[PDB]
Design a protein around this nucleic acid. Structure first.
Lengths: 141, 94, 58, 344, 49, 58
RNA sequence: AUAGUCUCGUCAACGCUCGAGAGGCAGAGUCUCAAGGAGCCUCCGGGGGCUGUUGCCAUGAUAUAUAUGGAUGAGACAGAAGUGGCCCCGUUGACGAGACUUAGAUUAAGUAGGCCUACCGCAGUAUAUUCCUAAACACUAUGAAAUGACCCUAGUUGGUCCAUGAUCAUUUGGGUAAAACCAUACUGCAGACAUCU
């Protein structure tokens, strides 16, 4: 089938900057999937906003094909307030699939170290290098 | 010292020997208004008022023996009640 | 939700149940976003829309 | 076809027509077709002011070079600013503040006292300083130092060198805004400290640096050329009419027979109205022009669009400030049908 | 710290007593409504006591 | 002086801190030359600019 | 007197989704729910499919529960708490209360006094003058430049300025310190509904 990267580009909101490249989008989706296996993830606007307000640190991934736009139009400047890097991807179905849920989600906040279990700590250690290189490539934009 | 002092600013960072504060008070301070603590002791006077209307900052001119590096984030700085003037004055009249 | 819409040549709404039309344009959700009177993010929304000229009357 | 028409006559077919017919009077001229004495006495110079002299010294220099009776400016008195300076000569001094609502534009270099840990924060700080702002005038400025609110409408960070500690940014600001205070505030929000290294005004009111900007060498060379050669072309090239300062004003075209009465202080009436803008609102500031495009006066509108279109008589405008001289046009009042009928 | 712990214990006791009183109130008004429906008229306060 | 400029496609100035742009174009200084009211060289400047057509009146 | 308008609080009539709660919405705290797991089959420890229109949670709403939905959320604590956080029908008539009016809509160059003055419109002038002197800013005259000059607890190779004149010394001499508007006084020009064919 057609990939959701090329499919959802007409639906991308005008303020969806920075937008990930296809290789970067694949790396972000893989990192989100590994973090969801680590359970080091916040899904949806409510959880992401609450975690940002408490002071959690990580990476924010925002879907681009969001209608209406007032669902997510406060997230990027709120991430800038708390010094958290963010990046936009064009598809919310892919974000939900990588975020270990059946239905699509709007925004994902990877917070490393958010799981109390030791198995979650080991999974954090194994996806840590991918998370670090993704964050460096996002901040390089 | 005045009997009643109101919390005026919160510490942000030092800048060239001055203390930058985000205003936690709704009103604008007088120029050279003294800045106090909860102990009513003066640490300095207001040096500069800056920033947008929604987010006002002010820098304090530190006195003798008062160092900007000695203060930490979350410290509150207090002003006298008569040293505040309403923000409606600086806005143009209708 | 199920109500989707597109914009016609005149600018008015065309209502569909389809996520993608026959022409291939992705439809938009008709219902507005959830609002709370105690919302505290007008500064963030205004800043983001002002970075891209999306503020009405700008 | 009316887009190439000069100055205030540009796009004059968009004006609503109250009366299509009139009989011209062979008096006056176009602003570009004036004689050289009237051209200089109604002239405006968009000057590339240098850094070292102040604006007052530059205005005095232009007055001494061109042998004017007075010259004026309404620019901010920050030292070391280069770029746009609007110099009004003689009568044009009365229009020295006609474009204050347009604002100004600046390209500014900020020098930071220390290197930032994060580069992008500088841009973020600039985005914090856009909007209505609390500013106090600096010590150098002649304006009294009281706290005011000045609006920066839009700003853009052009470049930043963290090793050179120099940041070039463009800003659009309200008249009365100081960029020295803005650079000091940028340094205060960053925490490293900073100040204004260089400043350049790229737009002042309606006129900009791309809108026929000349240097002081151009003024002195043109005066030399006219003195020794009796050639007006270079002096006419560097000097612009005062009508350039009146763009963006709503225009009303006045019949020739009604011009000089307006110069004598009379209200403008409906029989003297010829053409007018769409959307003229009551109490707006408007410019009264002739059919030749020369400005009679700045006036205050006494009617709206429906009254301008459908009223047979009454006050159209009241003179706020008269630019044109008396008796440039003949005195033609008292000759109309209604006035002669009441006299009889 | 001891003052904070004492305040938390007092708040927990207060909300537990509130829950118990509301449970007793709703159970009593339900059985009183049933007794009024069976009786067909108003019930005296002595029977409720 | 630090402020340099180059000419864009539209003819407006692009301001920069660099001597040479990334495309390789040499940047020009944005500030004007220093003026003195006692300067006595208008004849030389006018003659040289008339030799090459650089007079604005010409 | 009469009549109208605006702001209000009661009754009557007629309609409606039939209207005050154990209610709803917004917000705060705690907890639960997102196929994040397990098995199988392939491909090169990881990737892709199958179980899986499965499972987990909510929902009886004029209702198919073999259903409809699930973070652009739902449920419990909570029939609670709180409301000095908000919301809970419409039209007509009458009564009562407080007000504003009781209005026929003028003026093709003004107002007030005794033909003339004063105010009004516009345009100008003045808002200290001369001499000496202090200061600021910029220029200019003379001499000094590539081993150029200045600053910093000072350099694994610091930074800034610099023939587009830096930084020093003598004073060589002149320049600038405005303009616009308000207020007061004075002077002058007009009282103009704009024909021209």
């Amino acid at each position: 089938t057609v990939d959701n990267y090329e499919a959802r580009m007409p639906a991308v909101l005008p303020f969806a900057k920075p937008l990930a490249s296809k290789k970067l989008n694949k790396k972000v989706l893989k990192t989100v999937k590994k973090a969801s296996k680590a359970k080091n993830v916040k899904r949806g606007v409510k959880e992401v906003v609450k975690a940002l307000r408490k002071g959690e640190k990580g990476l924010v991934v925002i879907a681009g094909d969001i209608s209406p736009a007032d669902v997510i139009s406060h997230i990027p400047v709120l991430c800038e307030d708390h010094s958290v890097p963010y990046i936009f991807i064009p598809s919310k179905q892919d974000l939900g699939a990588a975020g270990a849920t059946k239905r699509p989600t709007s925004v994902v906040f990877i917070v490393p170290g958010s799981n109390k279990k030791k198995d979650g700590k080991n999974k954090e250690e194994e996806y840590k290098e991918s998370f670090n290189e993704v964050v460096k490539e996002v901040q390089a934009l | 010292p005045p009997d009643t002092v109101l919390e005026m600013g919160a510490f942000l960072h030092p800048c060239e020997g001055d203390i930058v504060c985000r205003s936690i008070n709704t009103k604008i301070p007088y120029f050279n208004a003294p800045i106090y603590l909860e102990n009513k002791t003066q640490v300095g006077k207001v040096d500069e008022i800056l920033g947008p209307l929604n987010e006002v900052f002010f820098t304090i001119k530190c006195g003798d023996g008062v160092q900007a590096t000695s203060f930490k984030e979350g410290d509150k700085f207090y002003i006298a009640a008569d040293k505040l003037l309403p923000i409606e004055r600086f806005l143009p009249k209708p | 939700m199920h109500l989707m819409y597109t914009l016609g040549p005149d600018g008015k709404r065309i209502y569909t149940l389809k996520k993608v039309t026959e022409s291939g344009e992705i439809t938009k959700s008709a219902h507005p976003a959830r609002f709370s009177p105690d919302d505290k993010y007008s500064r963030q929304r205004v800043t983001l829309k002002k970075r891209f000229g999306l503020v009405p009357g700008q | 076809d009316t887009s190439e028409w000069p100055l205030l006559l540009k796009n004059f077919d968009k004006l609503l027509v109250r009366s299509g017919h009139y009989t011209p009077i062979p008096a006056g001229s176009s602003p570009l077709k004036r004689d050289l004495k009237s051209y200089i006495s109604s002239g405006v110079i968009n000057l590339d002011k240098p850094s070292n002299p102040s604006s007052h010294e530059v205005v005095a220099w232009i007055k001494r070079i061109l042998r004017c009776e007075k010259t004026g400016h309404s620019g901010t008195l920050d030292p070391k600013v280069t770029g746009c300076l609007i110099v009004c000569i003689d009568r044009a001094t009365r229009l020295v503040k006609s474009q204050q609502g347009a604002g100004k534009e600046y390209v500014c270099i900020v020098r930071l006292h220390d290197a930032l840990k994060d580069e992008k924060d500088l841009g973020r700080s600039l985005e914090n300083l856009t909007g209505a702002l609390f500013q106090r005038p600096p010590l150098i400025s002649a304006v009294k130092r009281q706290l005011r609110v000045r609006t920066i409408y839009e700003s853009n960070l052009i470049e930043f060198d963290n090793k050179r500690n120099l940041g070039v940014f463009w800003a659009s600001c309200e008249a009365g805004t100081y960029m020295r205070t803005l650079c000091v505030h940028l340094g205060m929000l960053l925490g490293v400290g900073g100040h204004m290294q260089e400043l350049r005004r790229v737009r002042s009111g309606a006129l900009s640096e791309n809108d026929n900007m000349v240097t002081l060498h151009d003024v002195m060379d043109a005066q030399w050329v006219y003195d020794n050669t009796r050639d007006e072309s270079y002096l006419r090239s560097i000097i612009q009419p005062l009508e350039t300062l009146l763009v963006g004003y709503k225009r009303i075209v006045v019949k020739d027979s009604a011009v000089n009465a307006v110069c004598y202080g009379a209200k403008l009436m409906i029989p003297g109205l010829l053409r007018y803008e769409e959307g003229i609102e009551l109490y707006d500031e408007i410019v009264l022009i002739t059919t030749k495009g020369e400005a009679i006066a700045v006036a205050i509108a006494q009617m709206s669009t429906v009254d301008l279109a459908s009223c047979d008589h009454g006050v159209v405008a009241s003179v706020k400030r008269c630019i044109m001289e008396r008796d440039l046009y003949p005195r033609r009042w008292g000759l109309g049908p209604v006035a002669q009928k009441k006299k009889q | 710290e001891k003052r904070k712990i004492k305040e938390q214990i007092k708040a927990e006791k207060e909300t537990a007593l509130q829950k118990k009183k509301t449970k007793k109130l709703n159970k009593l008004t339900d059985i009183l409504e049933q007794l009024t429906k069976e009786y067909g008229a108003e019930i005296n306060a002595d029977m409720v006591k």
